Amino acid sequence: ASATRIAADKISQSEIYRRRRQEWEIQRNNAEAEIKQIDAQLATLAVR
C-alpha cells in the first residue's frame, strides 16, 4: 500500500509537470501574438 501511494505521488508530479508545460505553451502563444500585434501597429504608425 505504501508503494502504490508513492507511485501515485510519482504520477501526480509527472502530471503537474505536464500541465506546467501546457500553461507555458499558453504564455508563449500569447507573447507571439502580442509581438505580431505590436509589429502591425508599427506598420500603421509608419503609414501615419
Partner: protein
C-alpha cells in the same frame, strides 16, 4: 408602397367587407388573385418570411381541424397530437431536419412511449427483445447504435494498448511503472525486467 399597380389597389379596395349593396361578395378565387398580386410584389427575404408565417398559421388551422374531425377520440390538444402523429406541429418554421432523421425521431418517440406503456395496449413480450434490452444504453440514439455496430465490424478503431477488459495485475503494474513524462531506454528496460 405595396409594390403593385393602381389597378391592383383597385382590386384590393374591391375586397371591401361592407360596401354598397348590389356588389357581390368576393369569391375565394378573388382573394387568391389578390393574394398572388400582393405576393408577386415582394422580394426574396419578405417572401421567405411570408412563407414561414404561413406555415406557422396553417399548422394551427390544420391541427385544430384534424383534432376536431378526423382523429382518434382520445386526442384533445396539440400536445396529444404530437404524441399521436409523432411530429411536432408547434415547432417554428426555422427548425430544419431531413426526412429520415424525422422518421428516426418519430419511431424513437414511439418506442419511448411504448416502453413506459403510455400507449393503449403494448405487446409485453416484444418489450424484452434484445434490441430493447439494449435500448437504454445503445439503441436509443443513432450515435451509440452506430458506435456499437462499428465496434462489431471494426474493433481496430476502439482498441487502445493501455486499457483492456481482463488484463492481469502484472500488466497494470507495468503500466504504473511506465506512466511518467520521462521514459529513457534504461527506465523501460528496467520496467520490462521487473
Amino acid at each position: 408602397t405595396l409594390g403593385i399597380t393602381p389597378d391592383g389597389v383597385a382590386a384590393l379596395i374591391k375586397l371591401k367587407y361592407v360596401g354598397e349593396p348590389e356588389t357581390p361578395m368576393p369569391t375565394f378565387d378573388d382573394w387568391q388573385a389578390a393574394s398572388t398580386l400582393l405576393q408577386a410584389g415582394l422580394n426574396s427575404q419578405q417572401s421567405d418570411q411570408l412563407q414561414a408565417w404561413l406555415d406557422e398559421a396553417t399548422t394551427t388551422a390544420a391541427s385544430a381541424y384534424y383534432i376536431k374531425n378526423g382523429a382518434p377520440q382520445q386526442i384533445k390538444s396539440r400536445d396529444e397530437l404530437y404524441s399521436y402523429l409523432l411530429i411536432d406541429n408547434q415547432v417554428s418554421a426555422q427548425v430544419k431536419t431531413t426526412r429520415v432523421a424525422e422518421a428516426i425521431a418519430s419511431i424513437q418517440l414511439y418506442v419511448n412511449r411504448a416502453l413506459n406503456n403510455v400507449e393503449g395496449k403494448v405487446s409485453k413480450p416484444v418489450k424484452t427483445r434484445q434490441f430493447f434490452c439494449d435500448w437504454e444504453t445503445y439503441n436509443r440514439r443513432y450515435s451509440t447504435w452506430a458506435g456499437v455496430s462499428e465496434l462489431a465490424y471494426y474493433p481496430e478503431n476502439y482498441i487502445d494498448p493501455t486499457i483492456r477488459i481482463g488484463q492481469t495485475g502484472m500488466m497494470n503494474n507495468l503500466l504504473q511503472q511506465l506512466s511518467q513524462s520521462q521514459l529513457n531506454i534504461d527506465t523501460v528496460e528496467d520496467s520490462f525486467k521487473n
